Design a protein around this nucleic acid. Sequence first.
RNA 1: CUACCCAUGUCCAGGGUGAAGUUCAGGUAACACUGAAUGGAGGCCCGAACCCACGCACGUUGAAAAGUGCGGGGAUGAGGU
RNA 2: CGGGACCUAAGCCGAGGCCGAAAGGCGUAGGCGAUGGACAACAGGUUGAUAUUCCUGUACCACCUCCUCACCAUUUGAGCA
RNA 3: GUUUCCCAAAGGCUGAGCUGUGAUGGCGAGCGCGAAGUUCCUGAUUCCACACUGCCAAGAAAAGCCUCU
RNA 4: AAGGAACUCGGCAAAAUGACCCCGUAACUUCGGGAGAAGGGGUGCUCUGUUAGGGUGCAAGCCCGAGAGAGCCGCAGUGAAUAGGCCCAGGCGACUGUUUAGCAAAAACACAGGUCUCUGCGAAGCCGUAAGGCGAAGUAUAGGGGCUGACGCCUGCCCGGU
RNA 5: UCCUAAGGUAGCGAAAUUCCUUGUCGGGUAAGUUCCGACCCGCACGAAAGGCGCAACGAUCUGGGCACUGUCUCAACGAGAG
RNA 6: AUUAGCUAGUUGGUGAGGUAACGGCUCACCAAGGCGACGAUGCGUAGCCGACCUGAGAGGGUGAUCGGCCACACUGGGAC
RNA 7: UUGGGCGUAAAGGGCUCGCAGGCGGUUUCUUAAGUCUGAUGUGAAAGCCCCCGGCUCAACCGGGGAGGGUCAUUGGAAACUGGGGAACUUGAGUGCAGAAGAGGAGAGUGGAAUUCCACGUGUAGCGGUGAAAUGCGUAGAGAUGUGGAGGAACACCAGUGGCGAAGGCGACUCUCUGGUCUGUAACUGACGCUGAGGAGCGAAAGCGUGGGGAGCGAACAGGAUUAGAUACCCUGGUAGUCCACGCCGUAAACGAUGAGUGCUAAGUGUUAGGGGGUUUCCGCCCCUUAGUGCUGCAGCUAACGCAUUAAGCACUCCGCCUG
Length: 85
Amino acid sequence: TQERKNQLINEFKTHESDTGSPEVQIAILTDSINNLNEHLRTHKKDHHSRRGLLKMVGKRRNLLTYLRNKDVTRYRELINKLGLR
RNA sequence: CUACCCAUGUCCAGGGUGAAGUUCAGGUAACACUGAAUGGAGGCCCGAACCCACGCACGUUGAAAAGUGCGGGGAUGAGGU
RNA sequence: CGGGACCUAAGCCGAGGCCGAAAGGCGUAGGCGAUGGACAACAGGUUGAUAUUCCUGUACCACCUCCUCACCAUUUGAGCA
RNA sequence: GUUUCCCAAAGGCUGAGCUGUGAUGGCGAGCGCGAAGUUCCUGAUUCCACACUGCCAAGAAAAGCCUCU
RNA sequence: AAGGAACUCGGCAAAAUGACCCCGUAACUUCGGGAGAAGGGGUGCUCUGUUAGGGUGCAAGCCCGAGAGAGCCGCAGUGAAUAGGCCCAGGCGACUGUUUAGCAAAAACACAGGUCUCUGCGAAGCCGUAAGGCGAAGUAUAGGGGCUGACGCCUGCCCGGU
RNA sequence: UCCUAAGGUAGCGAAAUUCCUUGUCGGGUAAGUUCCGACCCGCACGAAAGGCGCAACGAUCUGGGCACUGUCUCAACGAGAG
RNA sequence: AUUAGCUAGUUGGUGAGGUAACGGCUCACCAAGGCGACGAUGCGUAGCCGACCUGAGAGGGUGAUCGGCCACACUGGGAC
RNA sequence: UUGGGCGUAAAGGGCUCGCAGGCGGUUUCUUAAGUCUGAUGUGAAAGCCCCCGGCUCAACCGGGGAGGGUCAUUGGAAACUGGGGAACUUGAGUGCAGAAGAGGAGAGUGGAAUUCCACGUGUAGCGGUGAAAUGCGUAGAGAUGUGGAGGAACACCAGUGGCGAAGGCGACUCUCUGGUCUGUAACUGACGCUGAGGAGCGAAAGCGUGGGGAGCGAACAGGAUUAGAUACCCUGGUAGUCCACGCCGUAAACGAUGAGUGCUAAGUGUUAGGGGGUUUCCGCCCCUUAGUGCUGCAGCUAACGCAUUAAGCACUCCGCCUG
């Protein structure tokens, strides 16, 4: 957050100004989840943080299913950079 | 002797039964979960030694001032000495 | 080896001291007390009775130099513990 | 005993057995004498050994020992 | 032999069942069980086999013997000895445990859990007229005492007398 | 309507309690003073002297059915020990 | 769907036999598949169809007679 | 279906995250599964139906024809739908720059007030009602002064005010965390909407284990009230509420309105922005996104009412109703 995003926008540059480019957006969401997942292990009785997690799981499942039907190799190599299954 | 108790060594043929785990596979965002294998817990089961007296029979100037005979209940723990 | 001159728990005996209707339970110190720990040895004969003891073989165990060889050192002076 | 660095296999303590001796013996079926005296298989309740792992009820002491002054 | 509980306080006694492999298993259930429920089936010998296969070994050979096909035998085929009788309900005790040495093994005691209360540490309680060192090399998530008995649903009324 | 300090609620009920009794009504049997199912004119059930229901358990304890049987009508014979 | 799990000759292969004929149709072997929320398996129900009746049509009900076909011949099984 | 509904008449799931299934922005190439259409083959006959003829007409019977098929083959059509290939950026998302917040969870922090208790001071009652009694009191209450424990609730701000999807959340501060809205344009190039089962949340009551229990308070008790009072009133009063953790998963879980997309007069406040017009201003005025309320036109409605936050006109999806 605000320093890793400075790294990860620079990470998945297919073009130089890729501020969308959902392969960038997955890199925003995955480490947002791992920074959210370890909050749930601190606090289980919190529930109004998990409403965010279900959207962030739901947004990430949307962007992966998009890449299956356009970019076969790019979807594959993105998982290889993340290990997400 | 016995009743518990204190320190101390010691014994219990084999078979069954299979949890908590574990790992792998699947599964899930991830834990829940699922299936295999493994692992082997139990005042767990069946049954000898060994304890123990329930049920009849025998005994009752008995083999014996409490037994033997044919079978019976526990038998890795609140155990037996 | 089995038990002593090895140790020790359970428990007991217990200098003083705890200044107890007389006695007397016995209090640490200290030491008893083994079923424990510690420890050097077996394998073959043998009579009418003993046998990891007698005998024949073959070993170790601590202890001691009448000694022989070594090495180190007699005051940082080896060695003992 | 802790506390800092330096190396991550070596070392030690351990041991059931194994083989060589021990055996130029002693036993040994058999008639005081004495032959061959191997290999394979089975296989523990004894040994490594409370050694390992696991569980929970949290499983003596002191002296031989070894070391320090 | 025929008969099966008519015997009898009562299936007391006695027979009947047992072995291992394989198929199959109800109600209820606290999901662990119940269950080996029940209910039946095949087991011997000889040949395909020093077997399929394993162990073991360097091979040689030894042990382990899966399934079938074949076929012979008697009435029988764990032939001997010897190792569960099962099913339906019912109270009472939850349970394994313990006592009436030497009449009476349970429906009694114990039991986990519940629970009200005492007790601030030289605790309370106890031994018993002192000590001393149990409780405890413990400290209210601990230790005595009483009342019930796992778990599940529950535990209402009366403070007048004691 | 008198009397109490207060008058038994939940669940069970001829009960290991129940006298009259073998209560009555139903299944079990040709026949069932025991046993199970329900009835409540609970003599004298009742909530930690605990109340009820409970799968697993017992050399407990009552009742029923199969299997098989000298237990019995109805005795018989054989071995052995007196 | 107040029936969600069901099947081991089941489902596959190979060969064999068998049938006028294809085949697990039968058997050996080897493999573990197949069937399923588009509703399997199960259960209750019932012969189907051109057509009949009704409705304005879309549909709904019935499947008698006459015409098509299957199944059955007291109940069940086999075979010439 | 052609040929209904859902504010109150029977009916919106409490709300979400979503697999399967359902539906698709714009431009262009292509394909022909759907679709359109020819040809061929066929849907026997009787019957219906078109038209004749026969029986004394009719009924009946006969002749001819049509019709009946989500049919098959074959050949055409390419707009729309499905499929494939390629572009555009408004839908949706990302960056970046802002702004609002009682959104959640955590450990801690106070301030009045209730009671309790210690004590001074102080005397006959206070306490309570429709009236009064029970309760409390010469053992010193009530009132009053300081001090002490302890819990739970968090005035004022407070507002058809904020935010969350709903239930819901108001002392304070910190740590941790969700979404929201504006500003564009930097990016992606339709990546979206809805969603049976499935998953998670879900006030109060209740449940199990402990913690804590000051007020408050079912059950019960007492005093009245009353013909009766198992009630309203009355003084007490157990569980509870409270906390951590686990479960139940229901309500008028209400906007009695299922979620999204566009469109359709206004006027008006009000919460957060943004743009401008003279102005540093304050301010006024105007444009503009977003919830938030009220009065209103067309139309909808059986009437009340609803009206850019629809119950208007349309469409995609899910649930529900048939006295």
